[PDB]
Amino acid sequence: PREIITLQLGQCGNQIGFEFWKQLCAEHGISPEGIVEEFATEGTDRKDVFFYQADDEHYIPRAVLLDLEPRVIHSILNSPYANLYNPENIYLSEHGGGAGNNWASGFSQGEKIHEDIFDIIDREADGSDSLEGFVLCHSIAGGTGSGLGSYLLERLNDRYPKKLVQTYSVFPNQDEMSHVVVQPYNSLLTLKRLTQNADCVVVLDNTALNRIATDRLHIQNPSFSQINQLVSTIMSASTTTLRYPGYMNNDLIGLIASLIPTPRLHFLMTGYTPLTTDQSVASVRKTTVLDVMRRLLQPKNVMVSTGRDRQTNHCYIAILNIIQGEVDPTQVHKSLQRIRERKLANFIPWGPASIQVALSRKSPYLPSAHRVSGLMMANHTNISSLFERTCRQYDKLRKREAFLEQFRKEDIFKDNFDELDNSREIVQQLIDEYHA
Amino acid sequence: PREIITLQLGQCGNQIGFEFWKQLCAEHGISPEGIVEEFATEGTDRKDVFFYQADDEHYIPRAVLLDLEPRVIHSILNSPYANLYNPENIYLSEHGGGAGNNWASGFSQGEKIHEDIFDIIDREADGSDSLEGFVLCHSIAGGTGSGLGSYLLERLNDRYPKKLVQTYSVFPNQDEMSHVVVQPYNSLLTLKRLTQNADCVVVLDNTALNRIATDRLHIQNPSFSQINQLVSTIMSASTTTLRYPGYMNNDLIGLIASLIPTPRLHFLMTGYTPLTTDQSVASVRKTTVLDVMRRLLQPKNVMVSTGRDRQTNHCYIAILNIIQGEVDPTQVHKSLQRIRERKLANFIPWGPASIQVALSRKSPYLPSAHRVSGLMMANHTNISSLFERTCRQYDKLRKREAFLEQFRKEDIFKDNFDELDNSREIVQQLIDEYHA
Amino acid sequence: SKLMSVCVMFTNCLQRFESTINNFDSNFSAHLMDLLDKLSMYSTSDCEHSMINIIYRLDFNGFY
Amino acid sequence: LKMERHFEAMRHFLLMEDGEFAQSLSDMLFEKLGSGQTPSELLNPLVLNSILNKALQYSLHGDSSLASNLTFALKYL
């Protein structure tokens, strides 16, 4: 019916998808090894849209996880949520990889394991006779997720041409350049494949993570154990119309169709306010829906590093405001009434704009059926500031003679560096041209 | 809508604005860290006119506080009212300044921190699309509030030309000249900026403070802890038409428009009678409004050091008499009936005068809904006696060779002393010419 | 029926694998004039209570 | 009847003693600026009856229970 195959790949893409499947059992009322609660069918009306359909009421995840590093998968099998995963769909015990840290490693390893990489991931494709598409849950940081992920964006474009492609990709961190220095090279090589060899992306910045991780979360030493908490909730938040029973844009080709203006303009800004557990003691007094979307357009919950004074000459075109759970829908048109009076979104002068609001009932659970949740999927034309940030860090590195002799020994014979530079400037010029 | 940004600045301007925000929570029925009372919306019909508008029913103050001395801000964070203030709007922890005591220090420090001083205070400007104006809650005493405050009166005049400017500035003390001796220099340099680079001021004398501080308050050793009690009440008294729901002159550009005769004549005399707590036991017998404005024009509550025998050749032009709370409005026209019979205000012989009276309901509180309050905003032409007092102390100091070699080493190359002297005499001559 | 015909006109030129784009633009302006005539028909309804207030909020939502 | 609550509601929007509505009327007086230079379409009551309902939420006062008691009729002169 609407079966999606997630493509978890890389050192960071496997960990953000590990707790994504772990989030799904707590809201479906199911255990990874059994069914102890009856809340799975009376409370939740649809479960076989991301999981594989049941053979013994055991909803297998439709997931594949490949990585060159064996460290990310050795921290999985000792956890009690790995018995839900199957040891025959992806790998058996003692799976390995390369050495290995290179963008050209996984780019060259795709055609030497070409027979095996297109054998076991295609067995899940013909399980349903109407496949939705493929989401590449991969990474941009490092050479593991960026090297091999650029290969599958090409060969799955023609072997599966009538399928939706759209990824939840995480952006790397640009604070210092000591541990990694190959960061401007492997990022722009995948970013070219994300626009012409891929339809849509969902950007997730790393410098904007610790802006939120010290905002309300109150940590002193930033660890990697907090990167899975902001990411796994908004992943399950994006499929609330798709997993839980909704009516309009209840498919993944429903939501993405109403937000993309044009190809190579698909970078969607994400926002999510409620992350604090001591808000729970004051939501008993009928906290309404009239105050939760006034702060979405206000740049506080954003996960995109952008300029603060560059929003006057940029214009919103498509903005999504997803409320979940208890909505009190007699005032949801009242919340959309107050949008035109502030004009917090700059509107495009050539065409109409749209503020789309939708709702779906959440899990039968006490932290879910009590507190209001707001998921934002914006589309603003100030996203070229990240593309100006990455390009200015790209041409400055090529004048310092950095990784021009250390990178072209394997499988690179011609200069494909300006092939990425002009196509990035094509994106940056057509964005500003789009508001005439 | 009607959002005003207060510019608290200097050693004395930060302390008089600290209890000004602390006064506002006791009358709005709110706590600086929470909302425990429901009296904030049923009793008070408007709260988002000085505070920032709410995101979690947390009314953030629209305040900025800069000072060279870190002593005034280190006595803030240990008080429980500092959590209402934000540590990202103005400064984070461990903010500092100069050494420092000079008028030329802050006058030269404005263009070296020119990038940062016009960055974070402009973020609160575009929060509302219709900004009211700017009030400079600064000081004249010392070189801290007078040195840097003269710079923002110039660069905010053209960058924000369509905004109201009007300040509640405190005058320094002229009793002896031992601890400070630079008092005639830094005062007249700011007083020139208060007339041509500023529209209106609200004068607050220091020698008239201890006239009232020993009148009914009964202290033996005058401390600085009493200077915030007379000042913070009349600040909140001046916005009772603006904060609480009124009808006429309910804006700050409403009150100041009906009192200023002409530019460079804007020095308003202030009066406020009720400051005694043992009056409360006899206000239960319907103390009326017919006796509270007979003593306003009588020179007893004034905060301006002026001559007692100089009121016969001077004439009132505009006088404001603000009653608050319980008014009994069936006799408020009866109180204005008795004004023409005494003629306690000398009227200008060239044009008409005006005795404007207005009312607004006070806070739902027992010391506020029981005792009558009278706020005076006079405008009398005997205010040149202070300008004759400051000028006679200015030219006498320049003949004693005082601070002519100790003041012109930094950023002063020409004699700008008579540039302040003639413009002060222009004010003093046009005041006496104004009654033809 | 005019709105359904343009999407029938759309889905055949996407079915193929010149002249079709000006046929789309002429049919685009044709239904734009009819929805503006439909926009006046909502506002000339009865000069009455909230059934004109509901359909007004249809009309401003289609405008921005 | 609950008449005293309706009595207070008439005072706030006809007698103008909660002056936030009549201050917002000055902004509606800041939308005319001399007469006549305004459209004569039938959309002229359609967008002008709205902006007075939108002006009450602009001052953040009152529910929609008394807001049904206020209506605006644009006369023609």
The CA distance from A133 to A123, in Å, is 14
Considering only CB atoms, which chain A residues are within 8 Å of B123?
Answer: 308
Q: What count of Cα atoms within 13 Å lies in the side-chain half-sphere of residue A374? A: 26
- Continuous segment of H or E residues that includes residue A218: none
Q: Which of B45, B48, B250 sits opposite D23 (nearest CB)?
A: B250
Cβ atoms A1, A52 nearer than 8 A: no
Query: Maximum CA pair distance of chain B?
Result: 67
Inspect the interface and report whether the beta carbons of B55 and A308 lie closer than 8 Å.
Answer: no
Class of residue B414 by CB neighbours under 10 A (exposed 0-12, middle 13-18, buried 19+): exposed
The DSSP secondary structure of A298-350, one letter per residue, reads STTSB-S---SSSSSS--EEEEEEEEES---TTSHHHHHHTHHHH--SPBPSS
Interior angle at CA A339, CA A335 and CA A343, nearest 5: 165
Q: What is the resolution of this structure in A?
A: 4.8
Inspect the interface and report whether the beta carbons of B251 and D23 lie closer than 8 Å.
Answer: yes
Closest-CA residue in chain C for A350?
A: C64
Class of residue A92 by CB neighbours under 10 A (exposed 0-12, middle 13-18, buried 19+): exposed
Residue B108, helix vs strand vs coil: helix
Q: What is the number of other CB atoms lying within 10 angstroms of the CB of residue B85?
A: 19
Inspect the interface and report whether the beta carbons of C62 and A353 lie closer than 8 Å.
Answer: no
The CA distance from C53 to C47, in Å, is 10
Structure-block tokens of residue B124? 């609160």
Inspect the interface and report whether the beta carbons of A337 and D57 lie closer than 8 Å.
Answer: yes
Interior angle at CA B290, CA B286 and CA B294, nearest 5: 130
Q: Known binder of ligand: residue A147?
A: yes
Q: Which residues of A touch B (CB under 8 A)?
A: 291, 294-295, 298, 308, 342-343
Considering only CB atoms, which chain D residues are within 8 Å of A338?
Answer: 57
In sequence order, the 6+-apart residues with CB closer than 8 A to the CB of A376 are A269, A270, A271, A272, A296, A301, A319, A320, A321, A322
Strands lying side by side in the sheet with B373-380: B63-66, B3-9, B131-135, B164-168, B200-202, B267-272, B373-380, B316-324, B354-360
Cβ atoms A249, A241 nearer than 8 A: yes
Inspect the interface and report whether the beta carbons of D42 and C56 lie closer than 8 Å.
Answer: no
The CA distance from B303 to B314, in Å, is 18
**What secondary structure letter does DSSP report for B171?**
P
The CA distance from A416 to A413, in Å, is 9
Amino acid symbol at B204: L
Cβ atoms A20, A232 nearer than 8 A: yes
| DSSP alpha helix (H) spans, B215-280 | 229-238, 240-243, 252-255
**What secondary structure letter does DSSP report for D30?**
T
Class of residue B372 by CB neighbours under 10 A (exposed 0-12, middle 13-18, buried 19+): buried
Please report where in the chains the tokens 């929805």 appear, as a residue. C35
- Residue A320 phi, psi (nearest 5): -110, 135
List B322's β-bridge partners, or say none.
Answer: B358, B375
| DSSP alpha helix (H) spans, C1-64 | 2-13, 20-43, 51-61
Q: How was this structure determined?
A: cryo-EM
Q: Name the nearest CA neighbour of D38 among D72, D77, D8.
A: D77
Cβ atoms A49, A42 nearer than 8 A: no
The CA distance from B39 to B217, in Å, is 31
Q: How many CB pairs lie under 8 A apart between chains A and C?
A: 8
Cβ atoms A231, A202 nearer than 8 A: no
The CA distance from C10 to A337, in Å, is 34
| DSSP alpha helix (H) spans, B375-416 | 384-398
Cα dihedral B302, B303, B305, B310 sign: negative
Q: Known binder of ligand: residue B254?
A: no
The CA distance from A280 to A282, in Å, is 6
The CA distance from A10 to A17, in Å, is 11
Q: Known binder of ligand: residue A282?
A: no
The CA distance from A360 to A296, in Å, is 18
Structure-block tokens of residue B354? 């005006």
Residue A31, helix vs strand vs coil: coil
Residue B135, helix vs strand vs coil: strand
Residue A122, helix vs strand vs coil: coil
The DSSP secondary structure of A42-100, one letter per residue, reads HT-S--TTTBPPPSSS---B-EEEE-S-THHHHTTTTSTTSSSS-TTTS--SS----S-
Please report where in the chains the tokens 């479960």 appear, as a residue. A47
**What secondary structure letter does DSSP report for B348?**
P
Residue B223, helix vs strand vs coil: coil
Residue B360, helix vs strand vs coil: strand
The CA distance from A243 to A57, in Å, is 17
Residue A368, helix vs strand vs coil: coil
Q: What is the number of other CB atoms lying within 10 angstroms of the CB of residue A205?
A: 20
Please report where in the chains the tokens 């079915």 appear, as a residue. C15
The CA distance from A375 to A352, in Å, is 23
Q: What count of Cα atoms within 13 Å lies in the side-chain half-sphere of residue B128? A: 18
The CA distance from B266 to B286, in Å, is 37
Q: Name the nearest CA neighbour of B296 among B386, B187, B380.
A: B380
Query: Maximum CA pair distance of chain C?
Result: 53
| DSSP alpha helix (H) spans, A195-331 | 209-213, 229-238, 240-243, 252-255
**What secondary structure letter does DSSP report for A367?**
T
The CA distance from B261 to B350, in Å, is 13
Q: What CA–CA distances, in Å, run from A60 to A33, A136, A362? A: 10, 19, 22
Q: What CA–CA distances, in Å, run from B359 to B29, B224, B245, B247? A: 21, 32, 10, 9
Interior angle at CA B66, CA A311 and CA B34, nearest 5: 75
Please report where in the chains the tokens 């990425």 appear, as a residue. A420
Q: What CA–CA distances, in Å, run from B5 to B134, B136, B163? A: 5, 9, 11
